[PDB]
Design an enzyme around this catalytic site. Structure first.
Site, PDB file in Angstrom:
ATOM      1  N   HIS A 226       0.867  -1.184   0.000  1.00  0.00           N
ATOM      2  CA  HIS A 226       0.000   0.000   0.000  1.00  0.00           C
ATOM      3  C   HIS A 226       0.904   1.234   0.000  1.00  0.00           C
ATOM      4  O   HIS A 226       2.135   1.126  -0.080  1.00  0.00           O
ATOM      5  CB  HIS A 226      -1.071  -0.009   1.103  1.00  0.00           C
ATOM      6  CG  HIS A 226      -0.568   0.152   2.501  1.00  0.00           C
ATOM      7  ND1 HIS A 226      -0.109  -0.909   3.260  1.00  0.00           N
ATOM      8  CD2 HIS A 226      -0.565   1.229   3.323  1.00  0.00           C
ATOM      9  CE1 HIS A 226       0.209  -0.477   4.465  1.00  0.00           C
ATOM     10  NE2 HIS A 226      -0.070   0.812   4.528  1.00  0.00           N
TER      11      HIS A 226
ATOM     12  N   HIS B  35      -7.057  -1.774   6.219  1.00  0.00           N
ATOM     13  CA  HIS B  35      -6.146  -0.767   6.751  1.00  0.00           C
ATOM     14  C   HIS B  35      -6.053   0.445   5.824  1.00  0.00           C
ATOM     15  O   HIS B  35      -5.910   1.585   6.291  1.00  0.00           O
ATOM     16  CB  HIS B  35      -4.771  -1.410   6.976  1.00  0.00           C
ATOM     17  CG  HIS B  35      -3.694  -0.414   7.202  1.00  0.00           C
ATOM     18  ND1 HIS B  35      -3.501   0.199   8.422  1.00  0.00           N
ATOM     19  CD2 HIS B  35      -2.785   0.108   6.363  1.00  0.00           C
ATOM     20  CE1 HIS B  35      -2.510   1.059   8.320  1.00  0.00           C
ATOM     21  NE2 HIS B  35      -2.078   1.042   7.076  1.00  0.00           N
TER      22      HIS B  35
ATOM     23  N   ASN C   1      -2.636   2.069  13.173  1.00  0.00           N
ATOM     24  CA  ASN C   1      -2.856   3.404  12.626  1.00  0.00           C
ATOM     25  C   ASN C   1      -4.008   3.343  11.628  1.00  0.00           C
ATOM     26  O   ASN C   1      -3.855   2.822  10.516  1.00  0.00           O
ATOM     27  CB  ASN C   1      -1.591   3.967  11.992  1.00  0.00           C
ATOM     28  CG  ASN C   1      -1.668   5.457  11.855  1.00  0.00           C
ATOM     29  OD1 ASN C   1      -2.749   6.014  11.640  1.00  0.00           O
ATOM     30  ND2 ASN C   1      -0.531   6.122  11.982  1.00  0.00           N
TER      31      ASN C   1
ATOM     32  N   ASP D 159       5.877   3.085   5.356  1.00  0.00           N
ATOM     33  CA  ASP D 159       6.411   1.780   5.758  1.00  0.00           C
ATOM     34  C   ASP D 159       6.373   0.744   4.632  1.00  0.00           C
ATOM     35  O   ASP D 159       6.912  -0.346   4.811  1.00  0.00           O
ATOM     36  CB  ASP D 159       5.760   1.270   7.055  1.00  0.00           C
ATOM     37  CG  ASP D 159       4.251   1.079   6.958  1.00  0.00           C
ATOM     38  OD1 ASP D 159       3.558   1.937   6.368  1.00  0.00           O
ATOM     39  OD2 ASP D 159       3.728   0.092   7.552  1.00  0.00           O
TER      40      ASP D 159
ATOM     41  N   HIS E 185       1.614   3.821   2.122  1.00  0.00           N
ATOM     42  CA  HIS E 185       2.253   4.465   3.259  1.00  0.00           C
ATOM     43  C   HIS E 185       3.774   4.276   3.246  1.00  0.00           C
ATOM     44  O   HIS E 185       4.318   3.393   2.577  1.00  0.00           O
ATOM     45  CB  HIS E 185       1.632   3.948   4.558  1.00  0.00           C
ATOM     46  CG  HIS E 185       0.229   4.409   4.795  1.00  0.00           C
ATOM     47  ND1 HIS E 185      -0.611   3.766   5.674  1.00  0.00           N
ATOM     48  CD2 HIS E 185      -0.461   5.494   4.372  1.00  0.00           C
ATOM     49  CE1 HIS E 185      -1.764   4.393   5.751  1.00  0.00           C
ATOM     50  NE2 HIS E 185      -1.696   5.456   4.981  1.00  0.00           N
TER      51      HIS E 185
END
Ligand SMILES: C[C@@H](c1cccc2c(-c3ccc(CS(C)(=O)=O)c(F)c3)c(C(=O)O)[nH]c12)N1C[C@]2(C[C@H](CN)C2)OC1=O
Ligand SMILES: [Zn+2]
Ligand SMILES: [Zn+2]
Length: 234
Positions: free
Chosen positions: A85, A150, A181, A89, A87
């Site tokens: 995805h 998420h 998160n 990280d 983000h």
């Protein structure tokens, strides 16, 4: 010395590898975000005499350290990477990968979201994943879009030779007490997306979350439980 490495066991900037199965490793790194330190996972899968990487190590310096650790511990070239995805990280470090000769991939949804949010952008778009339940082959893995969880773009990865399910951040570790998160999450749809994962990969033997300790199939049900409770408390 053999246990799965944890957040307090990895200084920010170092990377550890952990053997999951024959030709399958996770990578673990740590990063600071809004004044707290978190661990995060990715995956490495042998692809003949090359390697497929799933997810960066959460930052440029961490991802350079990841490549060095792969060279030290495995000694095969990383030729392709998939980010699961948008983000940091998952994509933070894509520029380091691209400058090292790694071809970087993500869904069109991930690429658009990364660009709009100012995160690093994988080069190549992965078509065939835009509807929930879609799956495509990519080297030694299958990529599966379970639906929004998420994030709206989150992908899961299955290694059929080893029955390893890498859930990414749509799946939480057993010790988790909340849904992590949730800034970009769909808490209402997340349980339905996890159910799609459970139904598609009933033979999974190892399940790896985006952050924290791998386990078995119970990680999927636990994730649904913590997400529903998060929404219920909130
Ligand atoms: C980069 C990523 C991120 C940053 C910091 C922490 C996390 C966590 C996380 C994971 C586990 C637990 C323990 S636990 C299950 O027991 O709660 C936790 F406390 C936090 C995750 C994750 O859950 O995947 N991701 C995280 N970012 C940033 C953001 C985009 C920004 C908005 N512009 C905010 O939304 C992200 O996800
Ligand atoms: Zn995320
Ligand atoms: Zn995450």
């Amino acid at each position: 010395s053999g246990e799965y490495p944890t957040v307090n066991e990895i200084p920010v900037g170092e990377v550890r590898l952990y053997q999951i199965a024959d030709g399958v490793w996770s990578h673990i790194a740590t990063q600071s975000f809004d004044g707290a330190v978190y661990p995060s996972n990715g995956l490495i899968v042998r692809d003949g005499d090359e390697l497929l990487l799933i997810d960066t190590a959460w930052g440029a310096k961490n991802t350079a350290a990841l490549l060095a650790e792969i060279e030290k511990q495995i000694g095969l070239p990383v030729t392709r990477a998939v980010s699961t995805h948008f983000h940091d990280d998952r994509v933070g470090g894509v520029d380091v990968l691209r400058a090292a000769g790694v071809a970087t991939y993500a869904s069109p949804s991930t690429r658009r979201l990364a660009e709009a949010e100012g995160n690093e952008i994988p080069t190549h778009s992965l078509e065939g994943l835009s509807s929930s339940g879609d799956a495509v082959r990519f080297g030694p893995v299958e990529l599966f879009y379970p639906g929004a969880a998420h994030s709206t773009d989150n992908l899961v990865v299955y290694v059929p030779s080893a029955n390893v399910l890498y859930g990414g951040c749509a799946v939480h570790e057993l010790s988790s007490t909340s849904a992590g998160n949730v800034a970009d999450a769909d808490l209402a749809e997340w349980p339905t997306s996890v159910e799609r994962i459970q139904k598609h990969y009933p033979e999974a033997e190892v399940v790896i979350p985006g952050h924290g300790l791998p386990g078995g199939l119970d990680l999927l049900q636990h994730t649904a439980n913590v997400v529903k409770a998060h929404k219920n408390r909130s």
